[PDB]
């Protein structure tokens, strides 16, 4: 089952597959059988779903055998399985939307501690694999903290989030 | 009958539309009698699909028919 990882605010593109290369009808449905977008011939409609204003597609490439599902401003609340229904198949993919950041926005000093906040989608076990230019490649679960925060810790730390062998990079704000 | 330069008016006689709407809703009730039928407007999309469109006299009329499918319906008017 195809799985994708979002950054809780970026865009996502859900692509199906086809071979007949004629832009045949297609649909997207969640795990609860809810329509989000829609196709009636060659037009593009948006069904009464929570993702009415976020769904997007590449219409010019419909005749080339693609129907990528572009969604803008990804949020954790939209993580659900979606199904491709081009002709007779039920191809299914999943999205995992979460957010990684830090609690201390700007107020920081030398010799202080640092903590990270991770909000994973309901029903996920993300792992935080921090990577730092100074060699502080912290490894841990969803929540990770740093006991030292000095001037040498300058620069945004890239604490990646990995799960199911799929990993996405992130940045950490550090101002002192 | 719809007539009229970006403004025009279409006519709908509720006195004759109500009968057809009632027949259609009554027939729909058979398929799902346990359900309560509620109408509404479109969910959004292309301007040629969400709002009614037609080609008349070399003109591409787009008429907004929202105030005809939003009202809910029941066994009584």
């Amino acid at each position: 089952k195809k799985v994708v990882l979002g950054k809780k605010g970026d865009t996502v593109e859900l692509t199906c597959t086809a071979s007949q290369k004629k832009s045949i009808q297609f649909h997207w449905k969640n795990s609860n059988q809810i329509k989000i977008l829609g196709n009636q011939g060659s037009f593009l409609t948006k069904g009464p779903s929570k993702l009415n204003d976020r769904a997007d597609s590449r219409r010019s490439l419909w005749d080339q055998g693609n129907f990528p599902l572009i969604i803008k401003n990804l949020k954790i609340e939209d993580s659900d399985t979606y199904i491709c229904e081009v002709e007779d198949q039920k191809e299914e993919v999943q999205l995992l939307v979460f957010g990684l950041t830090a609690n201390s926005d700007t107020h920081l000093l030398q010799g202080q501690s640092l903590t990270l906040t991770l909000e994973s989608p309901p029903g996920s076990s993300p792992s935080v694999q921090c990577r730092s230019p100074r060699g502080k490649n912290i490894q841990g679960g969803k929540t990770l903290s740093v006991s030292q925060l000095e001037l040498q810790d300058s620069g945004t730390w890239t604490c990646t989030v990995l799960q199911n062998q799929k990993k996405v990079e992130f940045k950490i704000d550090i101002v002192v | 009958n719809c007539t009229r330069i970006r403004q025009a008016h279409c006519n709908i006689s509720k006195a004759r539309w109500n009968e057809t709407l009632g027949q259609i809703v009554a027939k729909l009730e058979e398929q799902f009698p346990n359900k309560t039928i509620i109408f509404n407007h479109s969910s959004g999309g292309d301007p040629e699909i969400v709002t009614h469109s037609f080609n008349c006299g070399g003109e591409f009329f787009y008429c907004n028919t929202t105030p005809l499918f939003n009202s809910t319906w029941n066994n009584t008017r």
């Epitope: 590449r58 572009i70 803008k72 | 959004g44 292309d46 301007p47 969400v50």
Partner: antibody, heavy 103, light 112 residues
């Protein structure tokens, strides 16, 4: 009724980036213009929501990064002017936002 | 780019008379019978208002007094009869191809 509404008056410092917004109503959400005295009207660029397509004139590359929004970078005294939002196909333009580039 | 030249720079017309403004393009704009020229009117404190589009048709809400004629690289915007409210700056713009350029402007003064 096709309607577009822009943000209020803005006063920003040179060298920074200032972002304006234009709202819409009465049609499907899915053009920018600059007017300066002695210059007339200059069509800045065009963009398309629901896919975010970009298009610029020769004198706007790297200067602008565009409910829709616009962001003008490398602000200078020349950018002090009024700006109009206009949904492209320009049927209607925004009322106008006055931007003053000064410290 | 397509360069638009307007004429005259300043125009004064008595109330009720005919006001004509010419716009010339550096390149041919006709595309098999159609001209993709636009003419806009602007007044202080207001955004430009589409007066003429397609070079031969009247925009909705625009009085029929405004009209357009010509072809090739020579077009004319004509106002007849001219009124007090007509005081404004008229601009000619080209939609023949990108980049989408604009005219030099032409102020209309209601001589009284």
């Amino acid at each position: 009724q096709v309607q577009l509404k822009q943000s209020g008056t803005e006063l920003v410092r040179p060298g920074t980036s200032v972002k304006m917004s234009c709202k819409a109503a009465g049609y499907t959400f899915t053009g920018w213009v600059k007017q300066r005295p002695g210059h007339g009207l200059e069509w800045i660029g065009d963009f398309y929501p629901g896919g975010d397509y970009t298009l610029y004139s020769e004198n706007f590359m790297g200067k602008a990064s565009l409910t829709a929004y616009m962001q003008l970078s490398s602000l200078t005294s020349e950018d002090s002017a009024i700006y109009y939002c206009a949904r492209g196909h320009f049927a209607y333009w925004g009322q106008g936002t006055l931007v003053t580039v000064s410290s | 780019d397509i360069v638009l030249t307007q004429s005259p720079a300043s125009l004064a017309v008595s109330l009720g008379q005919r006001a004509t403004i010419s716009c010339k393009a550096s390149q041919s704009v006709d595309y098999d019978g159609d001209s993709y020229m636009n003419w806009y009117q602007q007044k202080p404190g207001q955004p430009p208002k589409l007066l003429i589009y397609a070079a031969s048709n009247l925009e909705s809400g625009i009085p029929a007094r405004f009209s357009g004629s010509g072809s090739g690289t020579d077009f004319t915007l004509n106002i007849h009869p001219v009124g007090e409210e007509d005081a404004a700056t008229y601009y000619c713009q080209q939609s023949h191809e990108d980049p989408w350029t604009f005219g030099g402007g032409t102020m209309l003064e209601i001589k009284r």
